[PDB]
Symmetry: C3
Subunit: 217 residues, 3 copies
Amino acid sequence: PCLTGPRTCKDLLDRGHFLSGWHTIYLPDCRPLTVLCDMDTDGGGWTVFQRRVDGSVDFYRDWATYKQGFGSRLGEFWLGNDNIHALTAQGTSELRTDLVDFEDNYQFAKYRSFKVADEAEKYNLVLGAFVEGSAGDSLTFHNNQSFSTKDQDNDLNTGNCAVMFQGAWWYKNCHTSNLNGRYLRGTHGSFANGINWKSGKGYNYSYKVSEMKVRPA
Amino acid sequence: PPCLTGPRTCKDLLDRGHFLSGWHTIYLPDCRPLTVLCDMDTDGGGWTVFQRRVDGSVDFYRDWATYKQGFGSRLGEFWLGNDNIHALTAQGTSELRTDLVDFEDNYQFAKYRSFKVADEAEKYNLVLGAFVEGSAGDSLTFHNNQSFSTKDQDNDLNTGNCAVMFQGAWWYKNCHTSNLNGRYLRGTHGSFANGINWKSGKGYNYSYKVSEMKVRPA
Amino acid sequence: PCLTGPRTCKDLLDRGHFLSGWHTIYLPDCRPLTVLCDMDTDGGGWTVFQRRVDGSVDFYRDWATYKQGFGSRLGEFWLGNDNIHALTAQGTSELRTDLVDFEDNYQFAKYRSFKVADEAEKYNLVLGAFVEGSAGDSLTFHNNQSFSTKDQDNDLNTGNCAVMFQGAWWYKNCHTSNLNGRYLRGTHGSFANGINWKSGKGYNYSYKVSEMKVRPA
Ligand SMILES: CC(=O)N[C@@H]1[C@@H](O)[C@H](O)[C@@H](CO)O[C@H]1O
Ligand SMILES: CC(=O)N[C@@H]1[C@@H](O)[C@H](O)[C@@H](CO)O[C@H]1O
Ligand SMILES: CC(=O)N[C@@H]1[C@@H](O)[C@H](O)[C@@H](CO)O[C@H]1O
Ligand SMILES: [Ca+2]
Ligand SMILES: [Ca+2]
Ligand SMILES: [Ca+2]
């Protein structure tokens, strides 16, 4: 199947798959991966590597777990850092972030290009220009930063950001966005440890839905 | 353009011991593979679901193209696409079932001897057989023999645009007695007949919680 | 095909399926079966055979229907007794149960082993022994009874305990756990006919989430 197999959800849309769902694709080295395709948002063809929807999965996970990926196809997941690297290493994927609050308001953020490096470079975030988006730009702040988890500190803070904000991210000192934070359901008293996006609903409101997804430029 | 290679319907799949509802691949007429939702439970099981509404998560007020190719998500609401549905019902003779749930969790249903839609050439003309039964009453025969319409394709019998007037996409006459691709208005609504409505069921001013349209070989 | 594909969800996790979802496996007799793998909980690699989550599937069913299996891959289901049998047939696997109340508190129970008797010998519950559950042991009391359903009495009682409590279970005058009971959606005014587990919520409260699952040792 690797021969002439689809490489991204875009190929799958081009080839006539118009329903959002899980399909297998073939990574550059030919490894088959089953991924979530968003065929609807902003013209479709997006590969979704992060989804938050209901609080059912625990995102406070170690480096090994973020490495291989975790969660469920029936709901919330992180595709895996090795997987994300592979999806974004060769070519130019743009990045969309879709956000939904509990009052059912939708907001987004689109970036001109998105790439994460291999495990040897700490899954370094390399992020292109902010394009448009009502959610406002809350990821540029994180550009060119290593990824970190509770058991592996690569931040620019004297503490551990992933522990202080109970998540995992390309934290610097510490964060403006925190989509892998705890599912706190709306406004929360604690500071910045929920699924947050500063420019969007700020450090004190934890989104209901979060999706992170890539498409070839 | 039927495939003898493998399973042509959810019925075939049920027959080969697939007892759980879910997405499965069937083989249409030119052995074109399609992943479809099978209802393995309702009324003996083996129904292929081509329309599903559940939570209002997906926008159903879409244009011709979008309805032609299909839209939505396997995790939730979808319209299988008019090409797909035609392809599904062109060969043979399929029962149609409509299952409906209100927000008190009351179940209603309608059933029809046969259902097909013509190809795009003929505007996905609906061709419906006799009503068999159902607590929801018959709010579909009125639509027998009409072209499909969307908001950017008026093929109806009103001097206006039914799809715009009633925010949906359907085999609009002048205009309708069902509007299952209407807006998801959660129960009662004061607007007229622009919800997930079935006239003989909960009238023109109530929009259902769940709607499912499915076929099965007679 | 058969001699090269996985025979439990564990095998699939060892081959690098880190996300929970439906995958097909091959039983002892080479018949293929598509089962839900929990790749997440407790090291992952669990084949899930029962699942309650939203009360959308009628669990008030007969012998035949429990025999073949019923429900929706998208939601709630019973994998079916001769599958559950086929799975737990040759070898030995640990049963773990996972419960979640309508305020999002987690409770589980593990058992050294779990298997059901075949079509012939009714569906006799052959448990293992309790070992470390925050929801207590509400199943040891059921070890060694036949499965019974509204149309088949195999319990130790004058009336159908399954008709009494609208469930299907290894009953015996009567029950301490009613996982196939009704989804009475939390606090309820009838007795022992919800998705009940004594040690956990008592007899008049019905869980938000229930899952039973197995894994080799
Ligand atoms: C990928 C998929 O299944 N569809 C998601 C949907 O679940 C989400 O609620 C919304 C936010 O844009 O739309 C899509 O991103
Ligand atoms: C997976 C699926 O098809 N969904 C079920 C369907 O069996 C049925 O139409 C309806 C009640 O009839 O309940 C839905 O949730
Ligand atoms: C637990 C299980 O085996 N089922 C998965 C679970 O990992 C996930 O957290 C949940 C989300 O709805 O349901 C299923 O996708
Ligand atoms: Ca540090
Ligand atoms: Ca007109
Ligand atoms: Ca009895």
